[PDB]
Amino acid sequence: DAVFGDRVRRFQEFLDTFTSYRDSVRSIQVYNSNNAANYLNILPHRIIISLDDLREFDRSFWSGILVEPAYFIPPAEKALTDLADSMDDVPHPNASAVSSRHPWKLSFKGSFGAHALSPRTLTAQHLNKLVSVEGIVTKTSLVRPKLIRSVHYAAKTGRFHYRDYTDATTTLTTRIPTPAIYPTEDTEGNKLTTEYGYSTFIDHQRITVQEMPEMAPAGQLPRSIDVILDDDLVDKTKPGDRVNVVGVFKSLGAGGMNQSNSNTLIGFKTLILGNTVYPLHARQMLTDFDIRNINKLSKKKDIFDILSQSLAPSIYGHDHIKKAILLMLMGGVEKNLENGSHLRGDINILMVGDPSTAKSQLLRFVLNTASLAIATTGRGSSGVGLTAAVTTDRETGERRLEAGAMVLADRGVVCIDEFDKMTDVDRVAIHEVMEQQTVTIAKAGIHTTLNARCSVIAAANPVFGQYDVNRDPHQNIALPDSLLSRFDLLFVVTDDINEIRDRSISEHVLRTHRYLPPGYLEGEPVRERLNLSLAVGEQAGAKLAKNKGNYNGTEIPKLVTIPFLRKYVQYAKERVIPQLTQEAINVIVKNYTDLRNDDNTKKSPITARTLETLIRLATAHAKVRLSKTVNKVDAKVAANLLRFALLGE
Amino acid sequence: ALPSIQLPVDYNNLFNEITDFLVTFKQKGPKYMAMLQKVANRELNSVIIDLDDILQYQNEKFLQGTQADDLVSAIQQNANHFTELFCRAIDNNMPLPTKEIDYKDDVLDVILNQRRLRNERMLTELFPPNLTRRYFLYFKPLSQNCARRYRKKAISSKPLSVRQIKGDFLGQLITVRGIITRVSDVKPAVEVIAYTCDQCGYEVFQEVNSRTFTPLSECTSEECSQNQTKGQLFMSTRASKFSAFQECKIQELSQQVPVGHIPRSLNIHVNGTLVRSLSPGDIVDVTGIFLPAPYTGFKALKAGLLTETYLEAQFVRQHKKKFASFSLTSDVEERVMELITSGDVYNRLAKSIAPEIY
DNA sequence: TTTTTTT
DNA sequence: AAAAAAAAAAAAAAAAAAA
Numbered sequence A: 001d002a003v004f005g006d007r008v009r010r011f012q013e014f015l016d017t018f019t020s021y022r023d024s025v026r027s028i029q030v031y032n033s034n035n036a037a038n039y040l041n042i043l044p045h046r047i048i049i050s051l052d053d054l055r056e057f058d059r060s061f062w063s064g065i066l067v068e069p070a071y072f073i074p075p076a077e078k079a080l081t082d083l084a085d086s087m088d089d090v091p092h093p094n095a096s097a098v099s100s101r102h103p104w105k106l107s108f109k110g111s112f113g114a115h116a117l118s119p120r121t122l123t124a125q126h127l128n129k130l131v132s133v134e135g136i137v138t139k140t141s142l143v144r145p146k147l148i149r150s151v152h153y154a155a156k157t158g159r160f161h162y163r164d165y166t167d168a169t170t171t172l173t174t175r176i177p178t179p180a181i182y183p184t185e186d187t188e189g190n191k192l193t194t195e196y197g198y199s200t201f202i203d204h205q206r207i208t209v210q211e212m213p214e215m216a217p218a219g220q221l222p223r224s225i226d227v228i229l230d231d232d233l234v235d236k237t238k239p240g241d242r243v244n245v246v247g248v249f250k251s252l253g254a255g256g257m258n259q260s261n262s263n264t265l266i267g268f269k270t271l272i273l274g275n276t277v278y279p280l281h282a283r284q285m286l287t288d289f290d291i292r293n294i295n296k297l298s299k300k301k302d303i304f305d306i307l308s309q310s311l312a313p314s315i316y317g318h319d320h321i322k323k324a325i326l327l328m329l330m331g332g333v334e335k336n337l338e339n340g341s342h343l344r345g346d347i348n349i350l351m352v353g354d355p356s357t358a359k360s361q362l363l364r365f366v367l368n369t370a371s372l373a374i375a376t377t378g379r380g381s382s383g384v385g386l387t388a389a390v391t392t393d394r395e396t397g398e399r400r401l402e403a404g405a406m407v408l409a410d411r412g413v414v415c416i417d418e419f420d421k422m423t424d425v426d427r428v429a430i431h432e433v434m435e436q437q438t439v440t441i442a443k444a445g446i447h448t449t450l451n452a453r454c455s456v457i458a459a460a461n462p463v464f465g466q467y468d469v470n471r472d473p474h475q476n477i478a479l480p481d482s483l484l485s486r487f488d489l490l491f492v493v494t495d496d497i498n499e500i501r502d503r504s505i506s507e508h509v510l511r512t513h514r515y516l517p518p519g520y521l522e523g524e525p526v527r528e529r530l531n532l533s534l535a536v537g538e539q540a541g542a543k544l545a546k547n548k549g550n551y552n553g554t555e556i557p558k559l560v561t562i563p564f565l566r567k568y569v570q571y572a573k574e575r576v577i578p579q580l581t582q583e584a585i586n587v588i589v590k591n592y593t594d595l596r597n598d599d600n601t602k603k604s605p606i607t608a609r610t611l612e613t614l615i616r617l618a619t620a621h622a623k624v625r626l627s628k629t630v631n632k633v634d635a636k637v638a639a640n641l642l643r644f645a646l647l648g649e
Numbered sequence B: 001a002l003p004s005i006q007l008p009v010d011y012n013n014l015f016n017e018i019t020d021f022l023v024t025f026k027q028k029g030p031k032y033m034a035m036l037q038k039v040a041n042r043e044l045n046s047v048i049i050d051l052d053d054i055l056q057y058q059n060e061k062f063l064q065g066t067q068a069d070d071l072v073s074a075i076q077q078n079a080n081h082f083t084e085l086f087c088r089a090i091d092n093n094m095p096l097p098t099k100e101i102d103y104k105d106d107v108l109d110v111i112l113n114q115r116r117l118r119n120e121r122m123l124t125e126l127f128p129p130n131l132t133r134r135y136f137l138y139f140k141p142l143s144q145n146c147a148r149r150y151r152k153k154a155i156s157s158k159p160l161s162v163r164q165i166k167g168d169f170l171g172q173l174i175t176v177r178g179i180i181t182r183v184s185d186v187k188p189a190v191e192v193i194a195y196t197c198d199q200c201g202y203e204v205f206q207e208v209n210s211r212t213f214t215p216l217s218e219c220t221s222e223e224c225s226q227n228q229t230k231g232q233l234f235m236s237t238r239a240s241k242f243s244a245f246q247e248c249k250i251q252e253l254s255q256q257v258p259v260g261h262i263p264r265s266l267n268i269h270v271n272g273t274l275v276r277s278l279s280p281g282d283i284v285d286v287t288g289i290f291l292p293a294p295y296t297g298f299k300a301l302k303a304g305l306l307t308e309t310y311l312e313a314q315f316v317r318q319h320k321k322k323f324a325s326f327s328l329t330s331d332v333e334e335r336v337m338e339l340i341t342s343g344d345v346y347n348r349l350a351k352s353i354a355p356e357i358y
Numbered sequence C: 001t002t003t004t005t006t007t
Numbered sequence D: 001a002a003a004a005a006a007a008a009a010a011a012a013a014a015a016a017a018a019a
């Protein structure tokens, strides 16, 4: 009744108190006006409030929002729409666009406290309350438009008529439903023709979010909840992403309370009407002094080996492996020619070696360090289920392709463990994706080519229990040469038994096991923790807090922390696209001609494709030192690394 | 019942402007009368309209301060209503045939003459216009240089991707781009259904535009307005009207798919003479009308507000390349003369296949 | 002759 | 009143093959 008006005017007072939101609104309006008829991006009618300020202004209204959003959000949206309308000034508008009546729905950010949950913890007492849940994206439905308000016209009268349709999931408040029957007859029998181009249709997409399996109980499976989002943000993100969504948690549907029940133990449906979505990402931007620090690091003479040694400090030796991983994480550029089709651009590396020499650990470190990565095991995967799947979406009854494992990691990296222990059939699929980086699915009436430009890192065991150094290298490996020649770099690791190295590695390992988390005593085990205090988050150049990276003093050479290294990788993969020159060409061709005719024993035969590997390694090393041109020093280091990886020191 | 709103549009002035444009247009005399004349001679079977002419005519008549509004804007905002207006305008201003006609072949006109000489002779019904039209109406999108000619942003075109189409584009005229994957066969589609009621004078006609309908059972003639029917009525295939129909779907190109995504699809309905103007496996630029489709065909009773969408074709650019089956022409003749003058050929051809591989 | 692997 | 089914994953027995 009048409570709506009182809440609306109170919200108007609150909006008038602060000036940031009005500035955002006028910026949106001026951008929209500037994009009208000036020689494609548009800004949706959404503004984000920080309910910390709302709490600091009024506790009653804040509590009403966080306890019963149904009676509080719509008045706020109405007041915001009224303010936007008053600020709006369009003397000469259009005709079909002016009748949109976009209500400017809201988004939230700030500290929630006891209303930030997980998909397992959601239960009955949390219904009808605004919440914010974290999780992983499991699957997404198809974008489908739905109708809201139609427009009719009658030739005789010349009076346009409109009817508005709303459903349970359309609005937060339950109202008497209206069927989708088009009214085509007037009250006096006039004929009414539906007017498309004047009616209202909004997008609709359903997704399902799942709890992260790492934070799971003892011997229990991950669980998932249902999320509906519409209008804007309708197709953000994708399956296999860490997200945090804020929305209203409400129940819908009769659930069998009517005569349609068939058993006593029926239930009800539960569902989330999402308001806003944030990329959790367990942040991705660069500050001014961040760029200054990256530049001052890059201009140093010895950045590359510092970065290499910075990877996984708890693994002893394997320096060349660390360098190879560093070069692989930021590989060379793609080449496409109008006549030459496409050339592969990144690097692939394979590991074969004797048991218990820290290959899986390094692979796990690469998983954690890289931006986008997916973990696969040879015995736990099926080739057909790795690339695509033919499944039928529930709502539409139509069968649509489901993205496979390595397709999700396009442009990323995929790590495979127990590679040689995989079924041979699946192997052929790998060859396909190593041939032209494209997978084709022709089955059940679907013919489509899917892009997959990911890089592969894998480790495999020798045929015997341990590597035999006196035998043919092909004799020690169970994989055919057809796919082994595809891999750019192959490494053989063996634990030579020397008492000096034994003592050194023993000291290192014993140093590792004596570690205590900061701020925690040693008498009790590690416990679970709560999420960050704020559900949503966000003097320069004089502090160098984490810039130098040397967290503790253990060696004269410097070290850098993981976040700074990831920031460096992010900057390098975008801001520089180097080009090679003739001096590196001369060095590379000389080394290739020499290696081709050295005519001595070697781990693997060489062919023309190794020159491509040299080119891409030189490009990657130029990317490392942040130069737009490739100099002969990178050719030298690439040649040295190749000689180490194939000849042996 | 239904609330009312005020809109700036009014179709009377639009119809008058349409008729004025059609009659008075100067690009042979007027072009549109030139088309309509050969239409009258049963020579042209489909009419295609260009809005560039409309835009340039409106702009050049704007030099005199009489015009108050513009048409292409409302055309872009809504299309089917303007198709009906154009068909009405054409039927009002239809010229007489300037040539003789093989008049015996038109069996439908024979049936019409029989019905007229049956009913009017006893003292007659106005037949619906759709039952008589021999022509199809097609629209063509504009060209960007024409938009560059003037300051206004009369653009359209802009070949959006499959996934770039949102729910706000329903009812407009939009252009898509992609590869055609599936093409169905050609089947007849009903437009007007004619019955016969065992000599009931006039024979009832009805029209259906929806993809489903219901038939008639008892006619409204006076002898059957009597308590019992003068002979049961049956559907007549010969008198009814049909149009060629076909269905195709298009798929997004790989280049336009964002990373980590699966390409989507879009259906297309094609009618009239434009049927069989495209084959599976080719890149095209299709311009059409983005229309909704009711879900009641599924008959699931769910999806109270959810509906499916489709596109109706208007003008297709085949694009890609033509094999032409080495069809002879002057240019290829001088090309082969140049080849003969080249002397030794096979070595050059071998050198020119794959220079990438040394 | 026996065990393995594929249908 | 009816969505009902092609596509996958997993468990055997028979036959043939290699040592």
Ligand SMILES: Nc1ncnc2c1ncn2[C@@H]1O[C@H](COP(=O)(O)OP(=O)(O)OP(=O)(O)O)[C@@H](O)[C@H]1O
Pocket: A314, A315, A316, A317, A354, A355, A356, A357, A358, A359, A360, A361, A362, A461, A505, A509
């Ligand atoms: N240089 C090293 N520094 C630190 N730990 C090491 C080193 N070499 C081996 N280890 C230890 O050896 C153990 C071997 O574990 P892990 O299974 O990851 O090895 P692996 O060589 O990948 O073996 P597998 O082939 O069986 O998977 C780990 O606990 C690891 O800490």
Ligand SMILES: [Mg+2]
Pocket: A356, A357, A358, A359, A360, A361
């Ligand atoms: Mg291991």
Ligand SMILES: [Zn+2]
Pocket: B196, B197, B198, B199, B200, B219, B224, B229, B230, B231, B232, B233
């Ligand atoms: Zn009859």
